[PDB]
Design a protein around this ligand. Structure first.
Ligand SMILES: Cc1cc2nc3c(=O)[nH]c(=O)nc-3n(C[C@H](O)[C@H](O)[C@H](O)COP(=O)(O)OP(=O)(O)OC[C@H]3O[C@@H](n4cnc5c(N)ncnc54)[C@H](O)[C@@H]3O)c2cc1C
Ligand SMILES: Cc1cc2nc3c(=O)[nH]c(=O)nc-3n(C[C@H](O)[C@H](O)[C@H](O)COP(=O)(O)OP(=O)(O)OC[C@H]3O[C@@H](n4cnc5c(N)ncnc54)[C@H](O)[C@@H]3O)c2cc1C
Lengths: 460, 40, 460
């Protein structure tokens, strides 16, 4: 039985980060992967999705481009786009392989079962180690009445735009995945309706900026139905007749689509692993219970990323992987960081910290500052501005509490907000930082100024 | 000396030389609180 | 004689920020503008140049876009482009005008002249006030042997691409202006040669990242001649024969082009302002002498922006306007901020803080961290991953000293660096901040990790 200092189950963002960081710390590491190296993010999540969005955006912007003399008759070859998407994934997943090898990590292909705290079985063989890190990720959450099949897709199938664009698509789920894929399909020419059970899309994020995203999506012809649920459907000669009803119940309406995309959530892949028999506690939804050190109920066994707890984000899994490895290596690390969330639609949506409501519920004397992109010189030089930056803070201490952005490059601008939170910046600190002009980042500075009623580019 | 903008701003408006305000972080970062603490 | 609490001369970034901030503080303000409202940045600087760059980038990216199936036959109507450009400028300057009026600031069109430390002359009328803010800006610097004319253009003339593109262009100057306009012309079809006297372009910035931009520019066909200087030229039948020599002198050389753009710097507009009459002193370069409070040698008279001191940047001018206005208002503000600088080429270049050379010279034990965009997942989903991020820090204290970036969105990512510096961040704080994945901003976090030899996406 080969032994190691640490064994990592899963080479997804969380896993390959834990494996590599562990190696850097001098541990002999074994990494197990049942499928494709790189996990969901690189294979059927983040990466291919961002690639499709970039192509869709390049195509879409050509319309506005006509406004400044750019005449063209674009023709997007879907088979070619699919090829590129695949080439991008292959590069990145291959890169991780190279990365793992360069750090002296042993990569084992196969499904791993947890034989016990310090032991694991793969392809028949057994393997031991003083520390085990569980990073098995998650999978698409099924929806009652809409089982996955030929006409009901999960995000993975939805990525293969070269296998047939449906004339009409129904997207169930107003979260990041649903919004992104819905927009990709719309820009590729399909009619798209998206429904969300909660009062607003991005239910966990700031409602005001999330509403601006929704209205922007609807301007592109995407029909967004909030406070709505899909009850069931029936396949007929002309398509899938889907029954929608208000969330709280009531008179329903019927729509006909060719395909349905179910993106209502994710399910942690923690079943048939042996966690049960090994004394590792899992909660109601299948998430492995852990403390801030990423430690499970079993000493020496850690859990990270999507399999451990929400939010199901890649950067969060990456950091938890670092924390887990560091503790396996003997250090004293804990996860206590601001975690931003981004939606790569156009416009983009990004948030970090507390919403006005969470802040108030927390007892702060909430005050907010807003700056619209319509007043951004940079936004105008980019072809037009729709969006805004909202900063949430405490008016007594002047402490920044949360930042929410909707507009181009929101995902890039939120990192500054995250650093701000980590550094304990006040609204004044943010307002006094000299941002380069002209840039979209100035909206953050101006929002901070609006918070003190002294923004310059808008009337206060 | 390392002082966040908010602290430098308040130090001036109080007529207090910022380099004279003791910090508080693991190693001297001056915060608005410190400037006020020195003011009293 | 009409009197006010404050009189601002000039409505460029500095002037209108001063005027508006002063009004917010309850002052009665008169703003005098001899030309177009909004100054250089909005009319013939930042804005129009950025708009051209965006149109050029949109066009240029279509080549790469062919890789993912986007086929198009792009034709760029230069008259329309010029039209959109004018529209953007008009929209923004109208915006400033609306802002000044909405703040209760009186706008007077004309050329102001100082008659006293508290009085000004405009067209013949007398206007006085307790405080005066001088925001007259700068103008193109003329190069010996290349006097401006029909064949020798300044940045303002270069902006008018609708008036016909020369087949061959020579740009003199490797600063932000020359690099940007040179790349715009190249992307619109012109052959371009840029000459820089110093060893590398952007002599004030990090030579490592600057060299990466130069190389990317050469890859597009732009001939960049460093350590070279243009001595003169003579107009002949086939064009302009310009003489080139090494920076120090020697073997002459000749290049033939249709037009020459001189972008070697700016000259502060401080003459015929009636200064040398109110007592206000100016240095040899022509800049109005001011302290950290933006106060000139005459109490009550302030000077900001390009007319006060370098660097000749917009965000700098804006903040100085705020400082000057707050002080005219009886407060006590001073400029002590980190000023970033950006070049909007593709790839973009941005920097803030100390270069390795400046830090070493100041006595810091310098250590650097680097992250290449070739290792960036986000950069790949965007097509080409050209660029890098370099952080400069103190090895003994772990304190961040400077940040330099070359790549897409470099200008947006530099704000995070500026905030980091303002907050006294260490390389560890930068690394501990959870950046969204996948985003270009992550490169900054990984650069911080590389500085500690523990980056994950590259071998340490
Ligand atoms: C369409 C889509 C788009 C997304 N976009 C974003 C985005 O833009 N930004 C973002 O932050 N997040 C995004 N996410 C979420 C992100 O992909 C996840 O948060 C991230 O992949 C979680 O990493 P992980 O390492 O925990 O797990 P995963 O990446 O899922 O990887 C777990 C790995 O373990 C392997 N494995 C599982 N069980 C076993 C076993 N028993 N033995 C051996 N190997 C095993 C799996 O095959 C897999 O490779 C997206 C998700 C989807 C579906
Ligand atoms: C081509 C180009 C591109 C640039 N790109 C950028 C960029 O991307 N980012 C950046 O940060 N900077 C850029 N700059 C520099 C930036 O434009 C300047 O730093 C900024 O405009 C300076 O603002 P200011 O208020 O000091 O002066 P200015 O904008 O010059 O404004 C001075 C104003 O005063 C008026 N005036 C002058 N004298 C008088 C008088 N006696 N009476 C009444 N009115 C008067 C002028 O008409 C003018 O409107 C660029 C410059 C150029 C030339």
């Amino acid at each position: 039985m080969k032994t190691y200092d640490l064994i990592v189950i899963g080479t997804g963002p969380g896993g390959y980060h834990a494996a590599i960081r562990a190696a850097q710390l001098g541990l002999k590491v074994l990494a197990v992967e049942a499928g494709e190296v790189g996990g969901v993010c690189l294979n059927v999540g983040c990466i291919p999705t961002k690639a499709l969005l970039h192509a869709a955006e390049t195509l879409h912007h050509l319309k506005v481009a006509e406004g400044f003399g750019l005449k063209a008759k674009p023709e997007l070859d879907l088979k070619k786009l699919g090829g590129w998407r695949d080439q991008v994934v292959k590069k990145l997943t291959g890169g991780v392989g190279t990365l793992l090898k360069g750090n002296g990590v042993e990569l084992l292909r196969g499904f791993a079962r947890l034989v016990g705290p310090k032991e694991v079985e793969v392809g028949g063989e057994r393997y031991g180690a003083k520390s085990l890190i569980l990073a098995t990720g998650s999978e698409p959450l099924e929806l009652k009445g809409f089982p996955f099949g030929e006409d009901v897709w999960d995000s993975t199938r939805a990525l293969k735009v070269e296998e047939g664009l449906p004339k009409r698509l129904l997207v169930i789920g107003g979260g990041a995945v649903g919004l992104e894929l819905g927009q990709v399909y719309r820009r590729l020419g399909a009619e798209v309706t998206l429904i969300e059970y909660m009062p607003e899309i991005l239910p966990q994020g700031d409602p005001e900026t999330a509403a601006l995203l929704r209205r922007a999506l609807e301007k592109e012809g995407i029909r967004v139905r909030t406070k709505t649920k899909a009850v069931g459907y029936e396949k007929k000669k002309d398509g899938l007749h889907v029954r929608l009803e208000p969330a709280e119940g009531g008179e329903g309406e019927e729509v006909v689509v060719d395909k349905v995309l179910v993106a209502v959530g994710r399910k942690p892949r923690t079943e048939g692993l042996g966690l049960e028999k090994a004394g590792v506690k899992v909660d109601e939804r299948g998430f492995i219970r852990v403390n801030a050190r990423m430690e499970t109920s079993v000493p020496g066994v850690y859990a990270i990323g999507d399999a451990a707890r929400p939010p199901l984000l890649a950067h969060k899994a990456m950091r938890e992987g670092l924390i887990a490895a560091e503790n396996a290596a003997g250090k004293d690390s804990a996860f206590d960081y601001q975690v931003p969330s981004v939606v790569y639609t156009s416009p983009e949506w990004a948030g970090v910290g507390l919403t006005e409501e969470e802040a108030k519920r927390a007892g702060y004397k909430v005050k907010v500052g807003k700056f619209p992109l319509a007043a951004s010189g940079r936004a105008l030089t980019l072809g037009g501005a729709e969006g805004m930056v909202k900063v949430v803070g405490d008016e007594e201490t002047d402490l920044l509490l949360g930042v929410f952005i909707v507009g181009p490059q929101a995902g890039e601008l939120i990192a500054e907000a995250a650093l701000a939170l980590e550094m304990g910046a006040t609204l004044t600190d943010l307002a006094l930082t000299v941002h380069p002009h002209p840039t979209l980042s100035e909206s953050l500075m101006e929002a901070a100024e609006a918070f003190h009623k002294q923004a310059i580019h808008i009337l206060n | 000396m390392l002082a966040v903008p908010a602290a430098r701003k308040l130090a001036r408006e109080l007529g207090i030389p910022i380099e004279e305000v003791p910090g508080s972080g693991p190693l001297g970062r001056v915060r608005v609180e410190d400037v006020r603490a020195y003011a009293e």
